[PDB]
Amino acid sequence: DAVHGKTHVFIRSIKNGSHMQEAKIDIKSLYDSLAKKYDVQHKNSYEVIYPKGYEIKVLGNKYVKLVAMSRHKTQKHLVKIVVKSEKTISLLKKQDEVVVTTDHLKVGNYVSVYDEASDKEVIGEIASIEDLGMTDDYVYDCEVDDDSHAFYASNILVH
């Protein structure tokens, strides 16, 4: 389990105790940015950043600390997951998509989805899963300060 670099995440950063900024940013962009600010630890093939004063939106539509972030090359296939939701406004149908790696979730399962326009969490259904094949690109991982161990990845809750 990692996510593709174009995965979107909701990030808050804090400075000087008193100032905070929040934005929706791609995870590769977040990584490259933090790479200038902090610096990478290394394991067998992981490059890891332990940022301070960063937070990420997770289950419960709340921001918790982003404790670490990493990237690595992977042998695993990229898998595109499409998730549908809807609300009555008269039906507004929505879908979101996230590309993850995994060696391991099922079409038909329900998953939590962040409805950004109404700033609330809704139930989504996995509508499709597609094997996109192997990749040469880096894939990314977050550790989040929440016992859900999950964060919203392009509006879809992922672990």
Residue numbers in the entry: -1, 1 to 15, 15A, 15B, 15C, 16 to 85, 95 to 109, 128 to 182
Show sentences the authors wrote:
Here, we report the novel and atypically split PolB16 OarG intein and its biochemical and structural characterization. The PolB16 intein carries an atypical split position close to the N-terminal end of the encoded split intein domain to give IntN and IntC fragments of 15 and 168 aa, respectively.
Ser1 and Asn183 at the splice junctions were mutated to alanine to block all splicing activity. We obtained protein crystals in this format for both the wild-type sequence and the cysteine-less double mutant (C111A, C165A) and could solve these at resolutions of 1.85 and 2.6 Å, respectively. Both structures were virtually identical (0.185 Å RMSD, root mean square deviation), consistent with the negligible functional impact of mutating the non-conserved cysteine residues. The last well-resolved amino acids, Asp108 and His109, show a conformation of the polypeptide chain that departs from the canonical intein structure. As a consequence, His109 is placed in an unusual position, remote from the scissile bond, which is incompatible with its usual catalytic role. Trying to explain the unusual functional and structural detachment of motif N3:10 residue His109 from the splicing pathway and the intein's active site, we noted in the crystal structures that His68 is positioned in the vicinity of the upstream splice junction.
